Structure formats: C-alpha cells, structure tokens
Amino acid sequence: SKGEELFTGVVPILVELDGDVNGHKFSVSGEGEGDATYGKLTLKFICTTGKLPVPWPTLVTTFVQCFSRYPDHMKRHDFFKSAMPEGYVQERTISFKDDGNYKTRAEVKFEGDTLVNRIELKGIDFKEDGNILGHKLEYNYNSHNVYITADKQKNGIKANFKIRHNIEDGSVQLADHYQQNTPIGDGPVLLPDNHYLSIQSALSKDPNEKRDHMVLLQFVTAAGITH
Ligand SMILES: [Mg+2]
Ligand SMILES: [Mg+2]
C-alpha cells in the first residue's frame, strides 16, 4: 500500500515537543532516523529551554509507532503506516501512580521525506517532591508490551499499557498509559485485529553533549498473531 512503501528504507525523524508540567514550561527538539524493516529507531533529544523539569525517561513514550516492524503476515494490521503520509493524531493520558498525569496530543506525519512527531504536553497534579518533579527516576528504561485494539468509530486504534520507571531507591513508578490514534488524512487506513507491539529501549548520554539531552535506541516488533 501507499503508506507501507514510505518505510521500506531509512527515514529521517524530527520530534518537537512543547510542555507545561505544573507550570514549568519547556521545549524539546529531537532528531534521528527509523528503519521499520528492522523495527529500529535512533533518536537524540535536546531540551532547548534549559534543564528538563521532569525526568527524561518519563517522556520516552511521548517522543513514532509507524517504525514498528510488522511481520509480513501482519501487514494488514499496521494502522500506523496506513495513515501515512497524511499522518495521525496520537493522544494519551499518562497517569503516574500516586502522582500527577500527562495529557499529550501529537501529530505524526511526513513533511516531505521526513517523519515528524509534533507534541503538546500538559502535566498537572504532580507532587513537588514526588518521583517526577523530584527527579528520583533512574536513567534507564524497561521493555514493555503495548496491546493495540481497533477504535472503529474514530477510524483508528487505541491502546492501554503500563510503563514502569525505576526509582533510585530500587522501587518502581508506574505510569499507566491510555492511547487513542485517529488518522488525519482521507486515505484508507487499516483497522487491526488485537495484537501487541514488543518494545525495548536503551537510554544513553552523548559524552560530548553539555545540553540536557537523551539518546534513545529502540526496537519495536509487532506480535501476538501467529502466521
Ligand atoms: Mg531547532
Ligand atoms: Mg531497580
């Protein structure tokens, strides 16, 4: 299909986020590339307003599931690529257990040959010395499954999954994710059977980078449907 073909090679990615968490306003710009043939993403994010007022790991899911590797036998379930190039809206509520929540609204679409993720993020109800505003989360990331289901009335998909952020004391900060995606354009989109995405993520630092930043290497594979 038209959308699938846009992802057979390496695609440059841009990410732009504006955020307000408990009145702390910040912006992040990211760049990298995705190779959906291998489910592979490489991204570097820079906080352009100074120090990021929340922990970098809490923004990983917000900062392009069109780069998931869908096995050939699962291609009819790939909503994300099917919406391209016009793209999709991706909305989430991320609920940090016993703490605040993020509400995010993003548009993921091509600008020319570049896949862009533009995000507005609003965070409220955070505790001043909770794990988020208190920067008590380790700089690392766990592997997760994301269960995707069709959202037919929206001509899109939804998902609900749990992200676990490691706390510096050895505990875990749960971040419940609820997600809804809607296509922007008028092309035919794929409405999938229930399936999951399996995600692994590695966070690192650029040793030569003095701005506040995050380097992310991620692999995403669709699964849950046998051939
Ligand atoms: Mg810039
Ligand atoms: Mg631990």
Instruction: Check: CB of residue 74 under 8 Å from CB of residue 53.
Output: no
**Rounded to whole angstroms, how far apart are CA atoms 181 and 197?**
15
* Residue 31 CA to ligand 2 centre (angstroms): 29
Cis check for the bond before 71: say yes or no (omega within 30 of 0).
no
The C-alpha atoms of residue 67 and residue 10 are separated, in whole angstroms, by: 10
Instruction: Determine the Cα angle at 16 with ends 11 and 22, to 5°.
Output: 150
How many CB atoms sit inside 10 A of residue 166's CB?
18
Nearest to 60 by CA among 178, 165, 134, 161: 165
The token duo for 108 is 């993921």
Task: Show the domains of the chain with their CATH numbers.
Answer: 2-223 (2.40.155.10)
Question: 114-124 and 11-21 as β-strands: parallel, antiparallel, unpaired?
Answer: parallel
Three-class DSSP category at 10 = coil
CA distance linking residue 150 with residue 94, whole number of Å: 20
Q: Which ligand has the minimum distance to the alpha carbon of residue 170?
A: 2
Nearest to 43 by CA among 214, 181, 227, 225: 214
Ligand 2 centroid from CA 169, angstroms? 7
Distance 46 CA to ligand 1 centre (A): 9
How far apart (Å, rounded) are the C-alpha atoms in residues 84 and 183?
A: 9
Strand duo 195-204 + 144-151: pairing: antiparallel
Bridge partners, 197 (sequence order): 146, 222
Question: Other C-beta atoms within 10 Å of 120: how many?
Answer: 14
Instruction: Answer whether 94's CB lies under 8 Å from 175's CB.
Output: yes
What residues pack around ion ligand 1 (CB closer than 5 A)? 29
CA atoms of 34 and 183, how far apart (whole Å): 20
CA angle 203, 207, 212 (to 5 degrees): 65
Residue 183, Cβ neighbours under 10 Å: how many?
Answer: 23
Provide the sign of the torsion angle of the four alpha carbons 111, 117, 123, 127, taken in this order.
negative
Ligand nearest to the Cα of 46, by number: 1
- Residue that has been written with the tokens 């354009």 in this structure: 185
DSSP 4: H
- Give the DSSP H or E segment for 43: strand 40-47
Residues making up the chain, counted from first to last? 227
Determination technique used: X-ray
Structure tokens at 211: 């701005």
55 membership: H or E segment, kind and range: none
Question: Phi, psi at residue 38, to the nearest 5°?
Answer: -115, 10
Report residue 150 CA to chain centroid gap: 18
Ligand lying nearest the CA atom of residue 171: 2
- CA atoms of 204 and 23, how far apart (whole Å): 28
DSSP string across 111-154: ETTEEEEEEEEEEES--TTSTTTTT-B-S----EEEEEEEEGGG
- Phi and psi at 154, nearest 5°, equal -95, 0
The DSSP annotation for 59-102 comes to GTTT--GGGSB--GGGGGG-HHHHTTTT-EEEEEEEEETTS-EE
CB-CB contact of 199 with 218 (8 Å): yes
Which amino acid would we find at residue 91?
A: E
Q: What tokens does 103 get? A: 């509400």
Q: Quote the CA–CA distance of 113 and 184 in Å, as a whole number.
A: 17
